[model samples]
Target: NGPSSSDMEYYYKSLYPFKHIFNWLNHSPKPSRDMINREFAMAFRSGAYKRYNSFNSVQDFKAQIEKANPDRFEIGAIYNKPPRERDTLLKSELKALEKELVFDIDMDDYDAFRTCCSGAQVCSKCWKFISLAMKITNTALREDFGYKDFIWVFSGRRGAHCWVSDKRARALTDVQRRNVLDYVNVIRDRNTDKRLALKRPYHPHLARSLEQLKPFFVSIMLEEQNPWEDDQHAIQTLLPALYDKQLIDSLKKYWLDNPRRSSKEKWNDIDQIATSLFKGPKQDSHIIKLRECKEDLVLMTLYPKLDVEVTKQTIHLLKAPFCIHPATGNVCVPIDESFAPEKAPKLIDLQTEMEKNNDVSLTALQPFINQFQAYVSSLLKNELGSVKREREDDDE
Candidate 1:
């Protein structure tokens, strides 16, 4: 399951990649205000959850991690002054900044329609929802918004955390951050079969996200998960989701006669009735609306349901990647191809390697560490470009 108390002590001392984490937050090799004044909260096994802690240097941060021997260390916003000394400040003086625009997409968010698992338990089928969230979010953040420094981390349990660490993202005002989330996190509710009342003339981002979600709806929702396995699933949920009385009535007629059709078959039934109208007649507005509703149906099923509070404010503290989730015993590794919750690095496994081979090079965690390093490098490269431009402009 997890590491012993002594094993966590060793993990803090040796396994956690302190330098890379330091470089990641510092945004440079040397100490910087970005890293120094940031708030860190430590939760002990006793649930003490000490906070307002800041460090002078990366080494200081690492030393604190070792000394405190925290069960989980969380990263918080960069405040005007060192949060460690925040008791000295007036209430208004605790201004925070440079907090990465963050997002939390929990698997439980999809529990209403996620047939495979629910509530702290997830299998591969349900995890595709996480994959879908990450896929759409990663594309929108990079391709649509011009952010290059976002990193996704598995939340060690049943969610994923996206840290949009681009300089622009970090510097966004809370209102600006809220606007970005408002656009990306459309379809806020839980049920898969629900109508999306998108205003006519779709925004490019919505259109793009819908296209991306379509295939996932088929593969993940219809084929693998099959949310409408029971008659009530189609009756109560799917009926209202499609919304049109004509099309809904036709699909209901078929389901009434054939209650046992698989999700794929039922989906084809809708397409059959819908497509049957399309042979020779010119495009009717009714037919067009049905198609549009079908696309919205996919959106309802597959779109990410974000915890808006995580992105809406700067005061939220997220568990840092690579920290072991206490209950799960898996380190919150970077999201990658091989990274599944079941396969994530376990403390017991890493400690076994620690005892068996004294080299301290852990096997399961190495690839994640390498990927984290490369992501950090990419982030620093952008920061360096900005610094170089500043220096050259001063010369001119």
Candidate 2:
């Protein structure tokens, strides 16, 4: 869809925000400890992979990037030793020191019930899923975990990635990342786990997540998705989620009588029929179980799913933002969410804009450039702020 590899170099030579990206990794304007040790991996045309690349100066970084013109380059952890010297260094001397905590949320993860879009065909209607995940995860990160610096990037095609760059977040131990990381991806199983086996006395995050996510449940899932409109989808998919014999039988009986109930109607029928179905003596516990199980159903249906493999590891190389996705030819803009990947600036679009003005800076893609600058400034601000506090002794 894009012009050949030669044309792709235009994106690298002109539009790539190497300086701002350098400062973001370097943590200061000068060549810092963080920058010299960070590993950058490049994927050139014909999909050649090169790793353990590191840099010392913005000029060198930009010069190397322009020369290589990788299809894309990914940022990885700052190593204990210079990654380029990995061959000379002892195995124990080379360890991942720090990397931004990442959350990889692909819309296709929700394809099991996401009726509006299937496997990379996304729209604003499907944006509700991404939109909901951002809000839920952002809430926990700020409130529960005390992380504030966040950069959300369009994944060029079907998803978004959040890089949590808080000082503490970057320094999270592998053990802690494995344990504390549950705040992002609550549900693990894909299609196999249809029912959420939520235990009683829900954990604080689980309880708060249901409370926050319940508002969007009916509007997004029940009405917008409407996956339960067909009778068999209702019986096969919806009934088992309820997971109670007496309640399932009565709902099945009512659904058979009704024939092809809407998801909204089926949701209403849960309480409606359960009231009548469980009015028998010694059924007080059934009502409590119904409320809890219904809560589980909402979580099963609407909860966000993150790429655990990508998030849990320190060594994985995420495709860098601002690079063009090979398939779609779209620039991975740092998003203010739902920035319309369809309308996103592309290499071809830049060529048209460049021909009009010979714009080397490319005003066509400046917002993302400016957006990235603003994000890096925050990192510098926080970095300097920490230095001021650290320099001051506790002694009166």
Candidate 3:
């Protein structure tokens, strides 16, 4: 089924703002290119983030790459100007005119593309599929979770992006991206599926058909006559079957109208909302508390029970990535992408098992050490006791 002519026209016309992002990222000497790439690499290295290409730059990526998790999400990063450029502006009185300047702006030369989502595909087909899944995630969060004022941006290339400006989305994490994506698509990951599934009160749009998606949705790019209307007004009057379509279109319109938004304001809203619900801190400062290795382990050990996560601490000391130790000073260990499989000690279970049965081989080292200690203690006792006797004999 071909897309309706009007829908195709909208897709092409929507390219204008998208092209602006593409041009900025693909063009050489773009200020955001390095920063966006750095931030993306950071996200990739931090965890198993989808490694897909949406466009050639951050803006394109955010605009195009389908989101990893469409539901209950608020993830985006700040675009930065290079330090040299900042310094140059600061040195001159023209710093005040920063907003008027344009940096990199041509996108014709960009070509490389890849899929970053772990299970999502890399080719054109996969990108489209992921985009559709994200559409579902977005709609569910808004209608079911009561989230509004969500802001989205193109990562310049490689991924479509959204950051929730409402306070309702502070507890989300990057890990949740894959989780939500899997859930929306009905893709099963044993750990996640077993944890999040519920038998009662099924999802609102669980039964909505693809044909009826558009009027209630704006995200999924349906192929047939594109049952969704361009106008949002149609969505409000839509039957339950078209709920996803309306929600999607609402988001798309919202995104186009507000292309530039402050990330700080977005998160501040999340923080405020999170505080009201007592859902946990909007910003997790606990990661800072585990700077020391002992503390890290202590926190790590307590993690399963306390839900504390011990990830990498980015701070460096004495020019080396640091880990705390009881014996050495704040030792700087080279964190050269070395991830060791560390888990909390299962001492209670192990101790109980060990106590139940005593094996000569397993207990060998302990008894040997104990015997050595007794031997040394007896020698010292004899030596000290004989000292006075020896002196008496010498005097006599």
Candidate 4:
């Protein structure tokens, strides 16, 4: 169970520390100052929102929030003057140029894989999916793209968001952003005959990525979260996309014959059968299908579900890190980069753990706060160098 509406409001009004969190946003090249000062917006408990066209500093932003006690806050771009005033020109708008390339992964995307929690409620089993998604995506962003600076944060509720603030990532155009999204999006069409289906010969890139996810498929998905016990219907639903009618019939018959076997044993039986059937000079047509089943099952169950639109567009505004979720009263905290998905913390009281860390006076949040400070520090050093070089050139 989560918090009540009134409890959430009370916490947001009293305990939630907006100043300690947003104060770090004051460094040079802030999360778009124009975005925060002017054109910044926030939604209240009633769903109504007010946008600011200007603010004096981070203190002003804090005071406005303190006065309004908004449930949700967002930062966007700014205008040269006030946008509401007459004769405001489009050219006066200073849009967010240094936008971080962001990825938003919501847990509702994994609804089918989940059995315990529905809607906004999440359990330990479901939360591991988020951890796994983070690991895979983080690896791809770093190793494949040569990106170094990343800020992985909890979305305050169902899933997580990754913000890439590297200068190169910030400068990417829409086309470049789309290319990156497409590269990582492995899951395909739903409600189709060929769902989770792939070409006969896996592309080398896809094969490599599949290798990264294999251990999770066997250990977590198959062993721990066995969705196919004695329930033939559950097994049948997934088998259709991978095997032929005859092969599926054979598997169902095998399940029926081995009445006492666990799902893991049954899955092992299928694996052995597929291997034996595919080893002959004259192999059955369905034998090839059986071999592909393992791959398809791994992909369908474990692949990351990306919010395509969020990553593709440049102008989309993401919820800032450290913002409290109005409904859950959970703080959007930073993720430990070295977190291991295979050894995920017991998430039975995961929300409570995060809420405890939400204390303003606690230094537990320093790691997350430090990540942002370090990011700004890097950008400032670069600016300092560029300005110094310009002064020297002028003197020469």
Candidate 5:
């Protein structure tokens, strides 16, 4: 129902603030109005952005982005990646960086933290909806609708963003969108009805100090005869070695299955993957702080398997999620030493003949998924080492 022009104005005025809040809440560290306007302009008004937005609705939105002339947007400079910048996008990274915001939260306080943090740092407080959005979309696409090229984008801000570009995704039926929106509200409370709600395990791992890390947790215990009776320095010195070992052992499986690539072609393949995974860091490019310690989680180079793949592939098509520096919106792909691929199973084959051509089955993919799961499971187990609980107990 198209509203009268005056009615449209009134409705927009009434709903714009809430809509903006919802957008901010899900994405995190919402940009200022000016920045948003600029993004809308660059991503929608410009030929590149419009290619994705020109569609009349969501279905169209998907098609436009896929078919949108790559040349139009591909040539522009993306500071966090190579390929020199075009005059228009030049310094766009700086512009984005200047707009980022940051906050440090004790993981324990994430909920209350989100509540209080919403009014100040973020755009919306009801972020639980994003998980729901992901839930509904993934199911609808995977089970009911059957989609694979679909992806989740973290918006380098808040909650996850869903991007789908499958050839059949030009327009989802109305029923599908409703099914999607059903799960896209800000909060999702647990329900008694099992069929209607997400069924995750209850209090599955209790031994890990960072229980907040939940499903990925590994236990960390300390002997009563503590080495650092008062030697805080000793404790700190020993922590990193333990952490490194845990990380290396846990991640060994990934390294073995997909060992790092070495050839120049692989590096080129990685360039695009790197572009997709790249997230802008929030730091002073001009200022050097010697005391400020940091870790480059997305440095794929550190992972031999990842590096090898990048060097071997001439073209790369990976859809992984990462956090953008909240302020700048520079893309941030999650490349944690702990990072594992998150994709559903599929069967694909190249056809030379129509009647009964070459075929690949889901069984073929099971080995890959199994290896990755094992690898990630081990790495996460050792990620925190013994320090996490010991340090916490000492404080208590």
Candidate 6:
């Protein structure tokens, strides 16, 4: 069922106070008056919400947000539109600052692979995918792209969004943004048959990714998922692509003979066959292909399925963190960087925590509130302080 009348009341009432908290939350600050005065976007239940995007200060944003009481709230890119004493969103003179590199991963995108929830619904079991995505993407952003600061947000529903705030990340050109996204994207093709093969000698990046993915595969994929048992066609489909024609026929016959064998048993038998075949020729191309097939099975199943175009585009409008997910009645909370990926709280639990104080107590959102605060403070210090100090130096 959708949110009840009472839930709707609670959401509206709670939001009255939330506007205060949201205004205090750090958005990327602009130094110039025109940039500061530029329009921020809002969406409302009625079409009565602000259409011109002309908020000049935090107070203005808070007032319009509270007045409209929108089902959804958005943060627009801080831009260089001419000042609202005379500015316009539609004018020919609009320019944008590349100021945050954001990534959006919606759980609904994984519906086919996930058994726990369908469509917009998600449970903790499915939530692990977000944690793993964050861990893998964060690592690559930091290790490969030289980024040091990132902020993660629970998208108030069945997903998570990451905002990379390193100055370099924000200022990346569209071409540079594509480079970062391309590096993060492991599954180049969505067509499953095309995904099971890696390049010759295996790229070090995919090698590292597999190393990170192995433990997750064992615990979550094998234990919780048991893909082979649940989806027999999975085996029938992937196996043929991995093995030669004769071997494929032999495996099918073996499955027919041992019809009662458990999935684990069947998988183990395939492993045995692959290993024994490897003994025949050290330099044989078949040996390399089989080994690659084994590794590819794990990755092809478990790797993050991303909406590459979203991250790849410089101008995508990612949902701002801390906005209430209109569907779920949950405040977008921060995921702690140190928390175990598999152990993150369920969406139900997160919603309960928000509802505990009738959504009034910011203190209830412990750790995440503090975490977001630290992120904002650090961003201001790193971003604004540098700008201010540069101005002082210019005065000399």
The model with the greatest TM-score is: 2
Least well predicted 10-residue stretch by lDDT in candidate 2: 188-197
Between candidates 1 and 3, name the one with more favorable TM-score.
Answer: 1
Residue-wise lDDT of candidate 2 within 195-309, one digit each (tens)?
6667769888889889988998888888899888787777776777776788888888888888988988898998888887778895788788878877887777777778887
The alpha-carbon RMSD values of the candidates against the true structure, listed in the order shown, are 2.8, 2.3, 32.0, 5.5, 25.2, 4.6
Give stretches of model 5 more than 4 Å off: 1-40, 43-140, 173-175, 183-326, 332-396
lDDT of 3 by residue, 1-396 (tens): 222333223322321123323322222224343223221221211244332112345454444323321111111222233322332444442111011000010111111111122221133432443244345545655766565433222222232333332322323343443344333433122121122222223333543323223342222212211222322321221111111233335444543464322322321332343334333572243222211211222111111110011111111001101111111111112111121112111212223334565532242123323433343344335434557568878987
> Which parts of model 3 have CA positions greater than 4 angstroms off?
1-131, 155-158, 171-185, 189-202, 209-396
Task: Name the lDDT value of residue 193 in candidate 6.
Answer: 46
Candidate 6, clashing residue pairs? 39-53
Worst-scoring 10-residue span by lDDT in model 1:
277-286
How far off is residue 379 in model 2, in Å? 1.2
Better of 4 and 5 by TM-score: 4
Which pairs of residues collide in candidate 4? 35-76, 38-53
Q: Is candidate 1 or candidate 5 better by TM-score?
A: 1
Q: Per the 3 Å backbone cut-off, how many clashing residue pairs does candidate 5 have?
A: 29
Model 4 segments more than 4 A misplaced: 1-39, 49-56, 76-98, 190-193, 199-201, 230-237, 252-262, 272-281, 284-289, 337-396
Assess candidate 4 and give its TM-score to the true structure. Answer: 0.75
Model 4: worst 10 consecutive residues (lDDT sum): 340-349
Error of 4 at 85 (Å): 7.0
By descending TM-score, how would the candidates be arranged? Answer: 2, 1, 6, 4, 5, 3
What C-alpha lDDT do the candidate models reach, one value each?
0.81, 0.81, 0.27, 0.62, 0.26, 0.61
Badly placed stretches (over 4 Å) of model 2 are 1-3, 89-93, 191-194, 249-259, 393-395
TM-score of each: 0.90, 0.92, 0.22, 0.75, 0.23, 0.79
Tens digit of per-residue lDDT, candidate 1, span 1-396 = 445788788888888999999889888989888888899999888769898998878689889999998888889899888898777878677888778889998888777677878898876667877887888888888897988788889888888899888888899888898899888977756454457766667788788888877866777877777877676787766667665677777778878888878887877787688667544655476567767777777777788889888988877899998998888888898884334677787888888876787777756788889989999998899899888889989987
lDDT of 2 at 98: 88
Model 3 score (lDDT): 0.27
Tens digits of per-residue lDDT for model 5 on 74-135? 10101132221223345453222111111011111222212223322333323332332344
